[PDB]
GROMACS .gro file of C-alpha atoms in nm:
model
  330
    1UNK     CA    1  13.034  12.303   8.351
    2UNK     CA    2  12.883  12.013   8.149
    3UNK     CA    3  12.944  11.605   8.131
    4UNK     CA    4  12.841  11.376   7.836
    5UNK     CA    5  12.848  11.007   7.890
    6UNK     CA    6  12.778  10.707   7.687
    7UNK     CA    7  12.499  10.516   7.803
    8UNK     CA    8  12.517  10.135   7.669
    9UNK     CA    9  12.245   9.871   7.652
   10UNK     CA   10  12.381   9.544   7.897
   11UNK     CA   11  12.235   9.284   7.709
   12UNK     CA   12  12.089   9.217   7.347
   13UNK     CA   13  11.711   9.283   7.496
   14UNK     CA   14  11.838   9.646   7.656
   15UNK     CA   15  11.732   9.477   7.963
   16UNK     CA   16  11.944   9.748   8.151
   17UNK     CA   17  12.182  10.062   8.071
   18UNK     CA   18  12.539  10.114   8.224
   19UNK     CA   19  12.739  10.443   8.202
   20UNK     CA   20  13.119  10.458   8.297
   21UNK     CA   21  13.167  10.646   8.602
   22UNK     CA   22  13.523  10.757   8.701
   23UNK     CA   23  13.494  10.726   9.125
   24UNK     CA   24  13.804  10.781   9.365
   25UNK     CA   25  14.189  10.897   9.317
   26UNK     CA   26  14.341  10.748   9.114
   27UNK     CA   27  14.031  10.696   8.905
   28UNK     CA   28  13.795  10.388   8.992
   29UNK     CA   29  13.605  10.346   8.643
   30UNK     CA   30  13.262  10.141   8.702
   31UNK     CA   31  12.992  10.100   8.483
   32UNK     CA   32  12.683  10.203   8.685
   33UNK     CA   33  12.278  10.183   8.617
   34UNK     CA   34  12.166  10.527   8.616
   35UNK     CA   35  11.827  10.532   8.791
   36UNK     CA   36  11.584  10.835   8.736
   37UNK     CA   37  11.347  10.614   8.953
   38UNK     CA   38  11.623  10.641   9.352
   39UNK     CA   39  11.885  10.839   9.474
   40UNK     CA   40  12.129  10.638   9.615
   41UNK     CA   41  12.484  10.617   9.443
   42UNK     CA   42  12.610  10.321   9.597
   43UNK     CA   43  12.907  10.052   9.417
   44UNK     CA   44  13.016   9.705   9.490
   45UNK     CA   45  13.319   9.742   9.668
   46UNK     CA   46  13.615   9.563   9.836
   47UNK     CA   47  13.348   9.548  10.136
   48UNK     CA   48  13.064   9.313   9.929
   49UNK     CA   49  13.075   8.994  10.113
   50UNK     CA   50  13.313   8.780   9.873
   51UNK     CA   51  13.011   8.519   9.797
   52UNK     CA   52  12.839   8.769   9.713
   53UNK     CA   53  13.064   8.913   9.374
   54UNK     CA   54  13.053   8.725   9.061
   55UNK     CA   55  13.218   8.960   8.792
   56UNK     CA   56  13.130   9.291   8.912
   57UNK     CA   57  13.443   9.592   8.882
   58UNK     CA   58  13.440   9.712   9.263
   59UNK     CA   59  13.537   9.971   9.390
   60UNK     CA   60  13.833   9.998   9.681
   61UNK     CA   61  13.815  10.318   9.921
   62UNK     CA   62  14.121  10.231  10.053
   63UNK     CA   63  14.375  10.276   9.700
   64UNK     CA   64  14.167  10.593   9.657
   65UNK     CA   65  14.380  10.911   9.801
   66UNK     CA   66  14.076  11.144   9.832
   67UNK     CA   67  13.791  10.851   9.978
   68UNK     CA   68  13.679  10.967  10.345
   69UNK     CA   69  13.507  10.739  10.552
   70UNK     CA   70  13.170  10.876  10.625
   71UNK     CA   71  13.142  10.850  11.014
   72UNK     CA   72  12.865  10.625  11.122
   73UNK     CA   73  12.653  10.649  10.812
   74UNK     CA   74  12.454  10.345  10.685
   75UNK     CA   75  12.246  10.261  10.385
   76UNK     CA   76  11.970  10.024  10.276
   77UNK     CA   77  11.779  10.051   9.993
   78UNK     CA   78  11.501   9.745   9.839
   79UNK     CA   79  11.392   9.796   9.523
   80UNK     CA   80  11.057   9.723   9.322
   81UNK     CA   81  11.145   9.425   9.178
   82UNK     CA   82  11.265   9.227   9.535
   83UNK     CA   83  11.608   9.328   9.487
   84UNK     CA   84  11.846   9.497   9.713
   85UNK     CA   85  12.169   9.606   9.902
   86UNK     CA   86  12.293   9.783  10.228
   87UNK     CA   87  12.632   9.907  10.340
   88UNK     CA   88  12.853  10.172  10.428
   89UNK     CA   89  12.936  10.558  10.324
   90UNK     CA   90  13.235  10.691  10.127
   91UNK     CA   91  13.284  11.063  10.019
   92UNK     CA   92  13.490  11.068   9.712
   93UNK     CA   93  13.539  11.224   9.374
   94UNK     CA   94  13.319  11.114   9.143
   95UNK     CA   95  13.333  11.211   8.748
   96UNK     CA   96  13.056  11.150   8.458
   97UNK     CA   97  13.177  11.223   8.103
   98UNK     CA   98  13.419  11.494   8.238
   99UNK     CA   99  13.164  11.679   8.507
  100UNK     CA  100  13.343  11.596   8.813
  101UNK     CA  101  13.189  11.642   9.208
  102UNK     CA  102  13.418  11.644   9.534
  103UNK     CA  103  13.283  11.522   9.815
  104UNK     CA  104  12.981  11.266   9.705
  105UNK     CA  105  12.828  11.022   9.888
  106UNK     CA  106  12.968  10.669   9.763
  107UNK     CA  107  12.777  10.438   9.902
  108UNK     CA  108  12.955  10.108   9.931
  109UNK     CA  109  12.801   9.760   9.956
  110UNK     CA  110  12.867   9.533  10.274
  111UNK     CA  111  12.524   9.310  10.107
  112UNK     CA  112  12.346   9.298   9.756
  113UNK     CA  113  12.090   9.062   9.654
  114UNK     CA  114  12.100   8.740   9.451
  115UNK     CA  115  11.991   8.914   9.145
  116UNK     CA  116  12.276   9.193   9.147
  117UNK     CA  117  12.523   8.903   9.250
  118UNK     CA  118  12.358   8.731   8.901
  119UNK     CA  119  12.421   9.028   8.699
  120UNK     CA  120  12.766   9.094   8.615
  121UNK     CA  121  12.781   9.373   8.387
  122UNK     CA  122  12.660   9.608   8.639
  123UNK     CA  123  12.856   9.783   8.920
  124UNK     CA  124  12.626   9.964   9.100
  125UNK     CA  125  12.345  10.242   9.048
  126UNK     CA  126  12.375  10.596   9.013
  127UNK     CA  127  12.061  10.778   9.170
  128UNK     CA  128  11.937  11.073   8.963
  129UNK     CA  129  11.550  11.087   9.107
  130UNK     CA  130  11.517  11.305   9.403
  131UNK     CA  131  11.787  11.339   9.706
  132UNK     CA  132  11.440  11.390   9.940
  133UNK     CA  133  11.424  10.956   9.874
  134UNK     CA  134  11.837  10.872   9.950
  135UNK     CA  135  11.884  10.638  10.227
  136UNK     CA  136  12.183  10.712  10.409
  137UNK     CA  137  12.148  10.720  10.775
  138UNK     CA  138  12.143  10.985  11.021
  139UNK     CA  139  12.242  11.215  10.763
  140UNK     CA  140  12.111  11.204  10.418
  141UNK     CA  141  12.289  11.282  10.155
  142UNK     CA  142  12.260  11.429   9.848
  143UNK     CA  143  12.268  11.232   9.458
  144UNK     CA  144  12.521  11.291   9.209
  145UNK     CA  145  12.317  11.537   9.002
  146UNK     CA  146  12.217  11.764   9.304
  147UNK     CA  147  12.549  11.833   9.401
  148UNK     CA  148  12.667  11.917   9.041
  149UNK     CA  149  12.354  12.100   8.968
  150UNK     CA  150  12.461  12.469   9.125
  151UNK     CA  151  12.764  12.455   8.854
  152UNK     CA  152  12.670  12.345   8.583
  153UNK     CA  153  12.580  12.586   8.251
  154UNK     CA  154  12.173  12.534   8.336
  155UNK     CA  155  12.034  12.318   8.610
  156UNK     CA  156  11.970  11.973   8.341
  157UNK     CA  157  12.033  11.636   8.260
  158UNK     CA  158  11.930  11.454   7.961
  159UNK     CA  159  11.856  11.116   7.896
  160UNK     CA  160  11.910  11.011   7.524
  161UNK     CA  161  11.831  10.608   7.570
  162UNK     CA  162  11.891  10.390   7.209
  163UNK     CA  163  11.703  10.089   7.104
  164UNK     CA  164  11.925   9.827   7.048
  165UNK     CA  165  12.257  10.064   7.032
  166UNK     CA  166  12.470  10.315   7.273
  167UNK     CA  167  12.299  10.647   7.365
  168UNK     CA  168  12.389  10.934   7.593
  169UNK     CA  169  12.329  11.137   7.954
  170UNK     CA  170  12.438  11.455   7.924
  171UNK     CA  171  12.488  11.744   8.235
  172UNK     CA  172  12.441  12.072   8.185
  173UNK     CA  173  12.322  12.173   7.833
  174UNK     CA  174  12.044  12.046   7.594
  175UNK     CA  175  12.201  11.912   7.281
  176UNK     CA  176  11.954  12.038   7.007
  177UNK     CA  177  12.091  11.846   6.743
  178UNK     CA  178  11.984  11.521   6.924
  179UNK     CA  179  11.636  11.568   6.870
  180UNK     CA  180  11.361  11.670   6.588
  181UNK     CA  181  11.100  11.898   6.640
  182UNK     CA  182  11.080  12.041   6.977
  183UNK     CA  183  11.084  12.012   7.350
  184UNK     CA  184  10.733  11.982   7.508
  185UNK     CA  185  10.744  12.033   7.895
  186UNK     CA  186  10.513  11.937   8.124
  187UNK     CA  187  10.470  11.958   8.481
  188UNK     CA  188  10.626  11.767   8.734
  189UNK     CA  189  10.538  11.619   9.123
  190UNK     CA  190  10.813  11.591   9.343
  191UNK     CA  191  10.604  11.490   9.656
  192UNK     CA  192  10.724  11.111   9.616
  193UNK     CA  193  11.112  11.217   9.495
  194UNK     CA  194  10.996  11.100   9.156
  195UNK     CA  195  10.984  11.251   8.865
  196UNK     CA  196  10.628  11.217   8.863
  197UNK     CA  197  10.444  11.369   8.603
  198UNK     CA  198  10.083  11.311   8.403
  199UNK     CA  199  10.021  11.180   8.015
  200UNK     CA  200   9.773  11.300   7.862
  201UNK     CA  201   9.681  10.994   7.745
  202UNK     CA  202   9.725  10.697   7.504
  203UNK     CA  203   9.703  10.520   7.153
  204UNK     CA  204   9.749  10.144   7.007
  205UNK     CA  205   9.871  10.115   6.697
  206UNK     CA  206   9.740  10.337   6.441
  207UNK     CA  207   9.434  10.364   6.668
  208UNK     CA  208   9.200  10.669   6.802
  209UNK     CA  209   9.387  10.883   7.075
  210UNK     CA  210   9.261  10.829   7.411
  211UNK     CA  211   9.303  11.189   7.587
  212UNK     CA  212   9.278  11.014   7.956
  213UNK     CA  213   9.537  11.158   8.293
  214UNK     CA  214   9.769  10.892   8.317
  215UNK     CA  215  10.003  10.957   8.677
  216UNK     CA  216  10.347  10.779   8.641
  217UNK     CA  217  10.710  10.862   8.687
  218UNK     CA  218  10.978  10.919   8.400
  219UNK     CA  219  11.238  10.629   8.571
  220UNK     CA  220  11.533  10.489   8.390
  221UNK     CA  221  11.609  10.250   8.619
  222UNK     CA  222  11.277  10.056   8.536
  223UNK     CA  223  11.286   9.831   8.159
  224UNK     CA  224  10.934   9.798   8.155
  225UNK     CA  225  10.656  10.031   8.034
  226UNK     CA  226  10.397   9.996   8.363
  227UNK     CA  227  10.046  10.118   8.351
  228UNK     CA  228   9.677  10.086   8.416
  229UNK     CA  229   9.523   9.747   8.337
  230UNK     CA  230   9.275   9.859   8.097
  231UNK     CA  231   9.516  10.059   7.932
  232UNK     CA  232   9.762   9.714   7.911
  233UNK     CA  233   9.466   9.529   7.781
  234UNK     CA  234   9.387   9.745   7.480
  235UNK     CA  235   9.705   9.742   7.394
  236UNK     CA  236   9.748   9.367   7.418
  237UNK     CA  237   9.436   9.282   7.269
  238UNK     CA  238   9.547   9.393   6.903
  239UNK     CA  239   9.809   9.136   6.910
  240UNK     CA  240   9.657   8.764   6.829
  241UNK     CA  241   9.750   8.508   7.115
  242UNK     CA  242   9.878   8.762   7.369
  243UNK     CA  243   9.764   8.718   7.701
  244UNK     CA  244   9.837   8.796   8.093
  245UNK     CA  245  10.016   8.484   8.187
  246UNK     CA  246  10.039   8.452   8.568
  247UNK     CA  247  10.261   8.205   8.613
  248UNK     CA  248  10.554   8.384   8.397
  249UNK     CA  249  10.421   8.746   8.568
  250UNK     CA  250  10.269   8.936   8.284
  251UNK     CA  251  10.131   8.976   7.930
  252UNK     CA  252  10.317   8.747   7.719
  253UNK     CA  253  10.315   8.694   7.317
  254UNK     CA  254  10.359   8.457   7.058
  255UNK     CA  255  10.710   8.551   6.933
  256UNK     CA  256  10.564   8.498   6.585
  257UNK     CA  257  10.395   8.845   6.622
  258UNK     CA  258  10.497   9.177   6.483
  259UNK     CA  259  10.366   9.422   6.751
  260UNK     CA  260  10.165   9.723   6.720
  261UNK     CA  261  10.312  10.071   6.797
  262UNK     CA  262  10.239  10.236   7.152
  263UNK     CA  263  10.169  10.611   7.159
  264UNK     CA  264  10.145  10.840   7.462
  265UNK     CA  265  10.069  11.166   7.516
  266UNK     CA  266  10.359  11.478   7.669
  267UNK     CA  267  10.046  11.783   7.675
  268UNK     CA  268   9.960  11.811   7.284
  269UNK     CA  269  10.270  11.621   7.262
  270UNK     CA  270  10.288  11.251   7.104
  271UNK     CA  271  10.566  11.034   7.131
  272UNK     CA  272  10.546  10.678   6.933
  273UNK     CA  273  10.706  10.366   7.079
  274UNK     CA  274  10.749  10.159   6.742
  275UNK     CA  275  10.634   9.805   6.816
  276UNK     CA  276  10.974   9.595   6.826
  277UNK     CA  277  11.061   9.804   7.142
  278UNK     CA  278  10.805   9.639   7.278
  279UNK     CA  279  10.950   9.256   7.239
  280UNK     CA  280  11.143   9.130   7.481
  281UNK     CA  281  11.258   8.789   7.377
  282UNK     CA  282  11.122   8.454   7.489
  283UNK     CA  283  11.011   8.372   7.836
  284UNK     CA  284  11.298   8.117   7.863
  285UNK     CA  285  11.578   7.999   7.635
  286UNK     CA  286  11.373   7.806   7.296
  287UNK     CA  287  11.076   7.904   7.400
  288UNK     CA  288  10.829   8.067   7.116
  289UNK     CA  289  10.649   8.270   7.412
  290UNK     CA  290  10.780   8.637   7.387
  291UNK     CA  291  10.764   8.862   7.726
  292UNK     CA  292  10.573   9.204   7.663
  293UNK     CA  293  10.742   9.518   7.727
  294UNK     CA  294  10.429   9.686   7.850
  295UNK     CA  295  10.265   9.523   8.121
  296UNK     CA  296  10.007   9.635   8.429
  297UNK     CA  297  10.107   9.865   8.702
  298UNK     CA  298   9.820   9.717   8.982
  299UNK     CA  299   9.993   9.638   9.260
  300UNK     CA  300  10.282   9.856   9.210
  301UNK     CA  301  10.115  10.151   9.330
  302UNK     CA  302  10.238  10.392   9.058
  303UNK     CA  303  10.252  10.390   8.652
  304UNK     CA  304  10.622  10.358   8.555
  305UNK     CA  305  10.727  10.500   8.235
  306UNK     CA  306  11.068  10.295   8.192
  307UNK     CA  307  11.279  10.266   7.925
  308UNK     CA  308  11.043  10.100   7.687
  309UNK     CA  309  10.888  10.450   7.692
  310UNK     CA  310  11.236  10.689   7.742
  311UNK     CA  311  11.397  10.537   7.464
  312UNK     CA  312  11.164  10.647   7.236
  313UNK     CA  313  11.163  11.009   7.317
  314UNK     CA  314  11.505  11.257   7.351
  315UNK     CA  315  11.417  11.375   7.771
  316UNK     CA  316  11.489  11.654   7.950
  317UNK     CA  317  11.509  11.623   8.344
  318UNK     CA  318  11.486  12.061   8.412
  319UNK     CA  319  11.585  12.053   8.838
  320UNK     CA  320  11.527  12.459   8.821
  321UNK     CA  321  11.384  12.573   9.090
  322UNK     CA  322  11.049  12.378   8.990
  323UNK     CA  323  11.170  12.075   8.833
  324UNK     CA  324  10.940  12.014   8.493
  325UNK     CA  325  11.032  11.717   8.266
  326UNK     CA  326  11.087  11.785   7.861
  327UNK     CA  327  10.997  11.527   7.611
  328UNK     CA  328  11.091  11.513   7.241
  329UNK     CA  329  11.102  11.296   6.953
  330UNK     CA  330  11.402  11.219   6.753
   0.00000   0.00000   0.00000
């Protein structure tokens, strides 16, 4: 089997992706954040304290003719950016651009956080990193992708993210008219249920290469680009005025600026992040201070390459049996 969805931008800025997702009997259609970066699959739901809805499609076990309560199972999951949500555990069909799985783990929300509450145009987050990190309690249980993965055509998804437009996830095959040149893979960690994998380095602009390891995880979920410091300065010092603002949180920009191009390494690989993905509006409403889409991992713990980064490139998440990650331009 295969799916193909359409993955749309939430918000002029791509400041998030949502994908349909067709969940119960009859079909439940929500528009979920896939998330390379977890592995829960969990929904707002008839459950979500009332207060705690503002827009959000939910999803109701109870007008769903296949949902099964899943006995005594719990979830909580916080997030790196403060946010979070706990509840309760639905089995359920659940469908993604036609590739449909019995029996997965809905996780439903009794709780979110203010800033899920805040955002409207998403319904919940599909988990796609790996099932080793899902929080369901006493039993663990498995993300969307792992259960499909045994029949699908080959053991894949891709993520085909657009800049400012629609692009796709698709299960199960490798479109290779999505993409120019080819596929370079490189190896991949799963020791912290990431997609964790190492760049081979770096360049600003139409700069020297810097062949440096870089650590990070390939994570959807995240908008940002995160890594080291000196990395974040280098690339901020080519652009006049930028600097590392801490009362807004991060490198900021005079909005004035065009932005240089961000290059990073996949082996002998090079994908280029043109500048303007890089811009992510003004700090607040009027302002002419622009927030920078690649900003310093310290104090995360872990370089993130988010979707400043996957956008750029055409990406291949290969779960055979040892996952490796595929990167191409296009």
């Amino acid at each position: 089997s295969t799916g193909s969805a359409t993955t749309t931008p939430i918000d002029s800025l791509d400041d998030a992706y949502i994908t349909p997702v067709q969940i119960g009997t009859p079909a439940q259609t929500l528009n979920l954040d896939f998330d390379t970066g977890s592995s829960d699959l969990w929904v707002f739901s008839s459950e979500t304290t009332a207060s705690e809805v503002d827009g959000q499609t939910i999803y109701t076990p109870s007008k769903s003719t296949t949902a099964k309560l899943l006995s005594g199972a719990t979830w909580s999951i916080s997030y790196g950016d403060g946010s979070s949500s706990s509840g309760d555990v639905y089995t359920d069909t659940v469908s993604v651009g036609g590739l449909t799985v019995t029996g997965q783990a809905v996780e439903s929300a009794k709780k979110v956080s203010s800033s899920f509450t805040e955002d409207s145009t998403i319904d919940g987050l599909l988990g796609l990193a790996f099932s080793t990190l899902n929080t369901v309690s006493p039993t663990q249980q498995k993300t969307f992708f792992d259960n499909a993965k045994a029949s699908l055509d080959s053991p894949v998804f891709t993520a085909d993210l657009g800049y400012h437009a629609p692009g796709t996830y698709n299960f199960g095959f490798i479109d290779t008219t999505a993409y120019t040149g080819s596929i370079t893979y490189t190896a991949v960690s799963t020791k912290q249920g990431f997609w964790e994998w190492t760049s081979t380095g770096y360049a600003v602009g139409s700069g020297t290469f810097k062949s440096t390891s870089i650590d990070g995880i390939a994570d959807t979920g995240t908008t940002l680009l995160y890594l080291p410091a000196t990395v974040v300065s280098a690339y901020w010092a080519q652009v006049s005025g930028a600097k590392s603002s801490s009362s807004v949180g991060g490198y900021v920009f005079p909005c004035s600026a065009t932005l240089p191009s961000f290059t990073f390494g996949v082996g002998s690989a090079r994908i280029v992040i043109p500048g303007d993905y890089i811009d992510f509006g003004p700090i607040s409403t009027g302002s002419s201070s622009c927030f920078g889409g690649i900003q310093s991992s310290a104090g995360i713990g872990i370089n993130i390459f988010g979707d400043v980064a996957l956008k750029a490139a055409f990406v291949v998440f290969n779960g055979a049996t040892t996952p490796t990650l595929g990167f191409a331009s296009k």
